[PDB]
């Protein structure tokens, strides 16, 4: 807590640096995100895996805002602290540095909060930052920014009275006493489903993602894909399943059909896309549908497998966004028809593209393979057909993945030259994390 105050105050000192010292501004904003990565690694060192489920607790009196660490929050916090310095390497202005610093404060505090009102306050305080990040004046899109902000606001406004309903019902929004009291679970369950089915892209409230994740800059796309979608999953695992479990059983056919149609229809839409960033953007919806069904199965080790799929997606899809961002930065287009023969002109970039293509399709020696196997073990244990639907549709994911790769990488060599040292080192931590988590993830 004292450490967190010191890290925030060190991060906020970027504004006071005079702008004529360019080197100092770059180094200060990069170190301001490097330090929380070290602190979260130390928190992993301090964790007792044979101890209590909630460790390193702190509660700030009668102000809500109570905090604690479990395994899902700790893995997601480690992933966020990895992803934020890479975002710092892709920005050039103090406005970008400050927006991403404020976003990192809000994400890190939202991932480990234990109060529902605290979760509401901390998460969607990032709405105006996302609006300004997506609708930036010369190269953004105001339509996309309006869509993402309005969908998130709609879901949050459905949740807010139900939050206050359980608060008047039992006397607290602390999740440890909300899980032990008697509450009207249908109303609160519908409010929580309303927020987290927009955060996780679940059809029909999913149309904001294709616009926002493409109109964003490369750093914004890395953040939005790798981090902000998983707040819906940790919302399911931390707040909704412990507090309204009767609802979570009774809504299972509806959540199940939403997940199945989201998976199938989003995979079918990904095949007709002609923009590389839109191809990468749609593929995330099917993965999150598998995550949601694995969470809702509650069957074998469902929290473990679903968290592991969230980590595998958060490693693999930001790297695909990084490669598309390199192509866009040095060729000024994201259109497939302008790219051919990238193997001959960018051999290192095409090799990285192929490896992350194989990772996104859940091939072995990548963490997505272990993730999808364990998620389908959790789904299979409820019924065999709910697993069969995901199993037989694997040709549809590989079709779009290999079609996009084969169209842009082979053929007549036209396009930009190979990657620089900076682009390679933006990609590199994700590759090392993927090789480790896909070969020896546990000990």
């Amino acid at each position: 807590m004292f450490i967190s105050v010191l890290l925030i105050l060190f991060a906020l000192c970027v504004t006071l640096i005079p702008e004529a010292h360019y080197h100092m501004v770059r180094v200060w904003s990069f170190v301001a995100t490097i330090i929380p990565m070290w602190v979260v690694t130390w928190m992993w060192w301090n964790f007792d895996a044979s101890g209590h489920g909630l460790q390193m607790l702190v509660i700030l009196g009668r102000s809500h805002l109570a905090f604690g660490i479990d395994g899902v929050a700790l893995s997601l916090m480690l992933l966020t602290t990895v992803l934020f310095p890479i975002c710092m390497m892709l920005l050039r202005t103090v406005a970008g540095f400050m927006t991403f610093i404020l976003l990192e404060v809000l994400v890190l505090s939202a991932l480990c909060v234990l109060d529902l009102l605290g979760f509401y306050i901390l998460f969607e305080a990032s709405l105006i930052l996302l609006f300004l990040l997506i609708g930036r004046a010369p190269y953004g899109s105001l339509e996309a920014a309006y869509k993402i902000v309005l969908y998130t606001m709609a879901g949050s406004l459905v949740l807010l009275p139900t939050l206050f309903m359980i608060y008047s019902e039992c006397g607290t929004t602390n999740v440890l006493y909300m899980t032990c009291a008697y509450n009207h679970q249908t109303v609160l369950g519908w409010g929580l489903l309303a927020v987290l089915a927009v955060k996780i892209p679940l059809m029909p409230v999913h149309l904001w993602l294709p616009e926002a994740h493409v109109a964003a800059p490369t750093a914004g796309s890395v953040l939005l894909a790798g981090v902000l979608l998983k707040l819906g999953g940790i919302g399911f695992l931390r707040f909704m399943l412990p507090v309204v479990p009767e609802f979570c059983v009774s809504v299972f056919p509806l959540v199940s059909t939403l997940c199945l149609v989201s998976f199938l229809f989003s995979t079918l839409s990904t095949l007709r896309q002609i923009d590389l960033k839109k191809i990468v953007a749609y593929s995330s919806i099917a993965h999150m549908s598998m995550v949601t069904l694995a969470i809702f199965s509650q069957s074998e080790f469902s929290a473990y497998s679903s968290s592991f799929l969230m980590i595998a997606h958060g490693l693999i899809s930001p790297a695909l966004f990084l490669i598309v961002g390199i192509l866009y930065d040095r060729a000024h287009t994201k259109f497939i028809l302008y790219f051919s023969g990238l193997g001959a002109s960018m051999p290192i970039g095409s090799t990285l593209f192929f490896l992350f293509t194989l990772g996104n399709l859940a091939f072995p020696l990548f963490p997505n393979f272990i993730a999808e196997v364990l998620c389908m073990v959790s789904i299979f244990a409820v019924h065999e057909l709910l697993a069969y639907v995901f199993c037989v549709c694997q040709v549809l994911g590989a079709a779009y993945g290999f079609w996009a790769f084969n169209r842009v990488v082979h053929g007549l060599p036209r396009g930009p030259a190979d990657v620089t040292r900076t682009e390679f080192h933006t990609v590199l931590p994700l590759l090392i994390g993927a090789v480790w988590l896909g070969i020896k993830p546990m000990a």
Partner: protein
């Protein structure tokens, strides 16, 4: 010596694709690849003699545990038993000669060391596949050979048809990979483990054998999955030899022989229909490599029926796999030498005479062709006659039709293989390029596979060779007469006037054309519906003009 058969081709691939190869060049990388295969073959020979003959299986915990959540436990462990030793000997011995051939065949390619590294990776993932003791490390090998097959089929990436052939192989195998994954889920759920030695099934829930059979039909290119196999000729000749002999197509048959959890009706019907279909397909082709590809599909049908017959049939199935790899790789290497001697032409209407090839290439094609058609007291005679005689005494009435289909297939095979020899050498010359290849490395590559053909006659694959299943002389010597009938018909070069049957068979029954619109175009159109009518239409929320 045991881990040297698996690690060390992977090491050769890692060396030849990394920036170490920037310091070696083509000349140094060829040396590295050939040596890294010789060591692995020597290790596999030691493993073969220890496990097959002296009967001492070896289990190695290699890299600890892979992942273990709940009761789902996957470990990095190998086990070297009889089937594993058989497969390792076959794979490494074929891949050594294919590497020695490819270091001379692809000499004028600009990226030679990349090609050699891909060949070594493909071999190493095959070794990982057969050396695994549980299902998940097997899936590592399965998808590894799938990926390396994609990289090697579409090697000449500036050609669009090669790229589309590689994508087609990936997609057709991805359907069966999905079914195989669901079958692994069934097996683990209802037996509690993933290791092969704890998977003893007497009576399971039907979906197990069916889904594992579909997953095997994908890799072994059976009926309604054979469509990728013919288009995989876009890759270079060493790729085709290694795909059709030791890697990839033999993996599904190995999996079914290992598990033995099938239901025999599906297996017998699929195998016999595949054998007859690929026999009539290869009888009506003029592309020299496509005839050999269809003969591979036909022999995989024979092995499928055999493993349907029983445990003895499973042993005969493994035996035919082992003897098939040697003469199939020899056939592809000899065909590559004939193609290079004739200026790259692959049409058998533009061959003839004995000037475009070495004496050893013609001898290799002749001996491997005689082993394939079941000429007496050669290598394929023992295994093919064993499968045919086991099918003639099965008490299942379904196996009665299967045996008739196999005998018709045997006559067709002796027809088109004799046609392949006749068009290539016996007729008058009708090409215009005579550049015969007489380099040392491809000739030694062919001589090694001919030595393995002799070895299979001298030392059998299993104990079935020499066992007498008691059949009358009429039933026993009929396949010899069918071989002679194929030879006489093909040398007479006779044809029929029923041109609509000829063009129905030569166009390969229209499977690709019917698949181009029964699932494929509907998938594209349903994607159009889900995007345009759903995302942009029914679910879209507009703006409020003011």
């Amino acid at each position: 010596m045991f881990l040297l058969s698996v690690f060390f081709p992977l090491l050769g691939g890692l060396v030849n694709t990394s920036p170490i190869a920037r310091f070696l060049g083509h000349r140094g990388s060829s040396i590295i690849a050939i040596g890294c295969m010789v060591v692995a073959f020597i290790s596999s020979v030691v493993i073969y003699y220890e496990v097959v003959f002296m009967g001492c299986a070896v289990s190695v915990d290699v890299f600890g545990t892979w992942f273990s959540v709940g009761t789902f436990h996957a470990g990095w462990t190998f086990n070297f038993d009889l089937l594993t030793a058989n497969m390792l000997f076959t794979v490494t011995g074929v891949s050594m000669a294919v590497h020695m051939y490819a270091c001379d065949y692809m000499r004028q390619d600009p990226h030679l060391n990349l090609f050699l590294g891909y060949l070594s990776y493909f071999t190493g993932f095959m070794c990982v596949l057969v050396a695994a003791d549980n299902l998940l490390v097997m899936l590592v090998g399965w998808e590894g050979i799938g990926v390396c097959s994609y990289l090697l089929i579409g090697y000449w990436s500036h050609r669009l048809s090669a790229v589309k052939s590689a994508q087609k192989a990936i997609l057709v195998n991805r359907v069966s990979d999905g079914l195989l994954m669901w079958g692994v889920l069934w097996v683990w759920y209802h037996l509690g483990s993933l290791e092969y030695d704890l998977l003893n099934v007497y009576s399971a829930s039907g979906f197990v054998g069916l889904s594992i059979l579909i997953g095997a039909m994908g890799k072994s290119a059976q009926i309604l999955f054979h469509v990728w196999l013919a288009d995989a000729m876009e890759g270079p000749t060493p790729v085709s030899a290694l795909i059709h002999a030791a890697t990839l197509v033999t993996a599904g048959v190995y999996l079914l022989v290992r598990l033995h959890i099938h239901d025999e009706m599906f297996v017998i019907i699929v195998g016999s229909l595949t054998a007859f279909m690929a026999g009539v397909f290869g009888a009506t082709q003029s592309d020299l490599k496509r005839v050999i590809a269809y003969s591979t599909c036909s022999q995989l049908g024979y092995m499928m029926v055999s493993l349907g017959l029983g445990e003895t049939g499973g042993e005969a199935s493994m035996g035919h796999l082992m003897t098939h790899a040697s003469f199939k790789a020899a056939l592809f290497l000899a065909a590559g030498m004939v193609i290079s001697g004739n200026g790259g032409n692959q049409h058998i209407a533009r061959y003839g005479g004995s000037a475009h090839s070495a004496m050893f290439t013609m001898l290799t094609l002749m001996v491997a062709s005689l082993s394939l058609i079941g000429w007496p007291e050669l290598s394929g005679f023992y295994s093919k006659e064993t499968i045919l005689n086991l099918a003639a005494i099965c008490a299942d009435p379904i196996a009665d039709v299967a045996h008739t289909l196999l005998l018709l297939t045997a006559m067709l095979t002796s027809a088109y293989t004799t046609k392949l020899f006749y068009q290539c050498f016996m007729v008058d010359f009708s090409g215009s390029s005579v550049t015969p290849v007489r380099n040392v490395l491809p000739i030694l590559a062919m001589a090694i596979l001919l030595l393995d053909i002799m070895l299979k006659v001298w030392v059998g694959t299993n104990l079935l060779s020499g066992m007498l299943f008691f059949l009358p002389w009429g039933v026993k010597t009929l396949p010899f007469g069918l071989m002679v009938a194929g030879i006489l018909t093909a040398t007479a070069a006779v044809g029929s006037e029923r041109f609509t049957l000829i063009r129905f068979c030569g166009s390969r029954w229209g499977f690709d054309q019917l698949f181009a619109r029964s699932p494929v175009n509907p998938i594209f159109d349903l994607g159009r519906i889900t995007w345009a009518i759903g995302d942009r239409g029914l679910l879209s929320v507009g703006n409020l003009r003011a």
